[PDB]
Design an enzyme around this catalytic site. Structure first.
Site, short mmCIF file in Angstrom:
data_model
loop_
_atom_site.label_atom_id
_atom_site.label_comp_id
_atom_site.label_asym_id
_atom_site.label_seq_id
_atom_site.Cartn_x
_atom_site.Cartn_y
_atom_site.Cartn_z
N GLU A 35 0.79 -1.21 0.00
CA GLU A 35 0.00 0.00 0.00
C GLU A 35 0.84 1.29 0.00
OE1 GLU A 35 -3.02 0.16 -0.78
OE2 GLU A 35 -4.06 -1.73 -0.25
N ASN A 46 -7.38 8.51 -6.47
CA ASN A 46 -8.12 7.50 -7.20
C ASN A 46 -8.82 8.18 -8.35
OD1 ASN A 46 -8.82 6.54 -3.88
ND2 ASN A 46 -7.44 5.45 -5.27
N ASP A 48 -11.79 8.08 -9.37
CA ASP A 48 -13.07 8.62 -8.96
C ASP A 48 -12.99 9.90 -8.14
OD1 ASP A 48 -12.22 7.87 -6.40
OD2 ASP A 48 -13.92 6.57 -6.01
N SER A 50 -11.55 10.33 -5.08
CA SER A 50 -11.16 10.14 -3.70
C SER A 50 -9.62 10.03 -3.65
CB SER A 50 -11.82 8.91 -3.07
OG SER A 50 -11.37 7.76 -3.73
N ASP A 52 -6.39 8.06 -1.22
CA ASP A 52 -5.89 7.13 -0.23
C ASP A 52 -4.74 7.74 0.53
OD1 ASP A 52 -7.60 5.15 -1.25
OD2 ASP A 52 -6.10 4.65 -2.74
#
Ligand SMILES: CNC(=O)/C=C(\C)OP(=O)(O)OC
EC number: 3.2.1.17
Length: 129
Positions: A35, A46, A48, A50, A52
């Site tokens: 990650e 991301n 879309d 968003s 992380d």
């Protein structure tokens, strides 16, 4: 902060993540590896819209507030910035809610694709814990 492998293992153990919901420490370390590569300040947008955040790449579409994710939720009740701290407490607490949501560590796609089923115990080999 960029943790060492055993350093991170020890921090996750200290914060009650070893065998949380039945996932051995190896699993948490392998996930954080793929990650964030152990880097608390890791961020990734991301497609879309968003983002992380942090060692376990917690996503603003559901878990933390970044103020720029339209329609999102903040189910961990934290600003996403708090997931970037040197101190992993906030990430560990939110990861505990994430892993309890129903699909276990499969919520972490990189865990599914790269850790699931593997000899995850290698990740804590040689660590004094
Ligand atoms: C680089 N970011 C990611 O891999 C995000 C993962 C899928 O999200 P989790 O870590 O799955 O997010 C709650």
């Amino acid at each position: 902060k960029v943790f060492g492998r055993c350093e991170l293992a020890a921090a996750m153990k200290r914060h009650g993540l070893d065998n949380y919901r039945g996932y051995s420490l190896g699993n948490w370390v392998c996930a954080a590896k793929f990650e964030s590569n152990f880097n608390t300040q890791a961020t990734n947008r991301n497609t879309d819209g968003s983002t992380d955040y942090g060692i376990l790449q917690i996503n603003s579409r559901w878990w933390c507030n970044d103020g720029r994710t339209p329609g999102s939720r903040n189910l961990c009740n934290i600003p996403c910035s708090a997931l970037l701290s040197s101190d992993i407490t906030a990430s560990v607490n939110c990861a505990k809610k994430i892993v309890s949501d129903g699909n276990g560590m499969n919520a972490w796609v990189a865990w599914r694709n790269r850790c699931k089923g593997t000899d995850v115990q290698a990740w804590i080999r040689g660590c004094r814990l």
